[PDB]
UniProtKB/Swiss-Prot annotation, chains A, B:
The gene is ykuD. Residues 2-45 form the LysM domain. It comes from Bacillus subtilis (strain 168). Belongs to the YkuD family. It is found in: Spore wall. Residues 56-163 form the L,D-TPase catalytic domain. This is Putative L,D-transpeptidase YkuD. Probable enzyme that may play an important role in cell wall biology. Regulated by SigK. Could also be negatively regulated by GerE. Transcribed by SigK RNA polymerase. Inactivation of the ykuD gene does not affect vegetative growth, spore resistance to heat, chloroform and lysozyme, or spore germination in the presence of L-alanine.
Amino acid sequence: MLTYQVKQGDTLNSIAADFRISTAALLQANPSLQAGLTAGQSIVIPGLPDPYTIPYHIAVSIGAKTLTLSLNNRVMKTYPIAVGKILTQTPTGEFYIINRQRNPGGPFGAYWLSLSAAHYGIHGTNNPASIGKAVSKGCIRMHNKDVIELASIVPNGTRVTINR
Amino acid sequence: MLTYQVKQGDTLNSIAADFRISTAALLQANPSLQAGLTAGQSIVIPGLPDPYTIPYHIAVSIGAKTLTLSLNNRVMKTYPIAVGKILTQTPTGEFYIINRQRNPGGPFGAYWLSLSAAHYGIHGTNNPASIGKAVSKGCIRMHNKDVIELASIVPNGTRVTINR
C-alpha cells in the first residue's frame, strides 16, 4: 500500500536500493507499467503499509539535534541524536522506516533501523559521547536505550521527516 | 476530525490563516484547551474531515510539472501543471484542500481550490501558455478543463502531497 512518487533523476535501481528490495520482485512486479522510468508517476512498494495509516510520525531537527516521536499529531518523546558532519550531512526531506535489525553491534550499537535512503539509517552507538554532535557519516545516532525504545514502538512504514 | 500538530511559532491567527478559518470560531470553539497554545500538542481543524476517510490522494511533482490524482492508491488521472518560479516557488510538503470557489475568473480561471498554506491554491488560468512552466507566484495552475474535472471529483479535506 505504500506509494512512492518517482522523482526526477531516480532510476529503477536507486529506488530499489532506497527501499531495500529487488528491482524485479514486485517493483516491476508490483508495478506492471514499469517499462521505462516515469518521473511524476506513482508506484507501489510491496513490503510496506500505507504510511498515512501509521499514526506515528518521526521528526528530526539537524540544528537542534533532536528526534521527536509523535502519535496522532501529539509529541510523545524527544531524544538527543548525533547527525552527520558538515561534509557528510544527514540528508533532509521525507523518508520512511524500511527495515530493522536488533543488535548489529560495532558502531551501530543496540539496533539498526533503515531509512528509505540507500546506506542511511537510525541506529545506536558504542560511542555514546558522540550523541548531540555533528559527527557521523550521515546516519542519525541514538543512545542505545532510546533506539531500543524507538524500535520497539514504530512499525516499518513510519514517516521520518528531516529538517535543518 | 482533521488534526494538526502545533509547530514552534504557530499563533492562533497563523494557524487560522492556513486553514481559512476564524480564530474564535471555529478554532477556539473546537479545541477548548486553547487558553494558551503549546508546541507539540494536537488541535482539530473545524470544517474538514479526517483526510484518511477520503480515499483520494493528490501527488504533485514540481520538477516533472505533473499533478496525479489517485484513488485507493491507484492513479486515476495525470495532469500538466504550472508551478512557482525559482524565486517564488511552490512549497513542498503535506497540504489539504480546504475550500473552493467556482469560476473565480481573472488569472484564476474556472476554479480556485485553497490549499492549507495561506494564499496558496490550485487554480485554473486565463494564461494557458503558462501550463507546464515554472512561472507562478507559487500556486499550482491547471488548464481550465482539468481543474473543473479535479474539483468535480475530490472533496475538501483531500491530501495534496507536493514533492520537488
